[PDB]
Design a protein around this nucleic acid. Structure first.
Lengths: 192, 191
DNA sequence: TTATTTGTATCGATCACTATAAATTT
DNA sequence: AAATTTATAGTGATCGATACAAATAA
């Protein structure tokens, strides 16, 4: 067939930014096409629909802005330092001038119309993973000796995931990076 | 002609639609069908979808935001104030009488530029949450249950962060026991 | 062919919102 | 009657999603 006249991954990144800022439903087809510099028929050719475009953009976001999460967790000598460096780097990215403020998974679709309930549920599932990720590192901690064997791994994981989701909301509110880092250290104070 | 609907009950229904669907996600169809009124009546009473949301937000704050300051000021220490506030808030977030999560956090975090006002409004209210903590801690400094050199803005922001995160978690159907454990864990960070 | 993409033109449905007039009070 | 609030029906605009034919490949 005719060769594609646009980079698919670049269009995915630009569609991902529009979602990151306006949310799944707030990002209209007009705003998407104007940012991806393509036309609606070209979009539906490639991606399939707004829902499908968002699922590809979320998969792309998790592979580009979700890699550092597991990398800094497993790259620390202790589970506490893993959680510490993860929260610090997550605040650095939430407050960086290169990326939109906050996490896409948290801000994109918390509520909305029934039509998007699938998208919403999808994001919810990903938030669940944010807990499991924490838990897994803590598990390794228990094996490494830096964490007690009887610690409630899912309680700590849920707590630090709660702090993570709260940090997205605070970063959307333009809370200074210094105060968000102070919040991270305060949250680390709650470690057993 | 007498109006065929009570304004406060219509605001109740409208705020429920906003609580589940958010500001832009709540269409006029879903709003009018829940309030059991017609679009001309809605626009004569409130003037605009944004006006309806502002009235519903004021009503929601007078109904589900008045207890915050009362529970904070009703405790002997700032620690117990924050503790009982978080525990009560979890109890409401996990009850089946109200939609799970706080409306101020869930209604509009992102959206179209056209709704910038609404979002900013909610943001302001979120700020007040921090203030509600800060003020109490100030009293805690005077009463002597909090150190004078306590970094209040870090502590207030931390517990407000936990509060906003609890709204998100309550939306994700996290059980009440898990959220209560999260609160008791967040209290361990207290100085 | 045989197939696929691209730009122009939309499609019906739904959005927030309202002009007009009947209905219901004093 | 006079003063409001309804209900009907529909406003332009925009929503996500497409025909259609020209355009570019195997």
């Amino acid at each position: 067939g005719r060769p594609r006249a646009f980079d698919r991954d670049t269009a995915l990144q630009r569609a991902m930014d529009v979602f990151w800022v306006r949310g799944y439903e707030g990002a209209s087809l007009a705003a998407l096409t104007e940012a991806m510099e393509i036309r609606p028929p070209s979009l539906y050719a490639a991606f399939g629909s707004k829902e499908g475009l968002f699922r590809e953009a979320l998969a792309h976001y998790l592979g580009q802005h979700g890699r550092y999460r597991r990398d800094v967790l497993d790259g620390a000598p202790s589970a506490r330092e893993g959680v510490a460096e993860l929260l610090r780097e997550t605040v650095a990215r939430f407050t960086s001038d290169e990326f939109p403020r906050g996490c896409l998974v948290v801000l994109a679709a918390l509520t909305g119309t029934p039509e998007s309930e699938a998208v919403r549920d999808a994001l919810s599932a990903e938030r669940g993973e944010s807990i499991r990720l924490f838990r897994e590192r803590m598990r390794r901690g228990i094996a490494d000796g830096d964490l007690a064997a009887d610690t409630d791994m899912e309680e700590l994981a849920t707590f630090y995931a709660t702090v993570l989701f709260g940090l997205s909301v605070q970063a959307k509110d333009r809370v200074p990076r210094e105060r968000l880092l102070a919040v991270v250290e305060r949250a680390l104070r709650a470690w057993p």
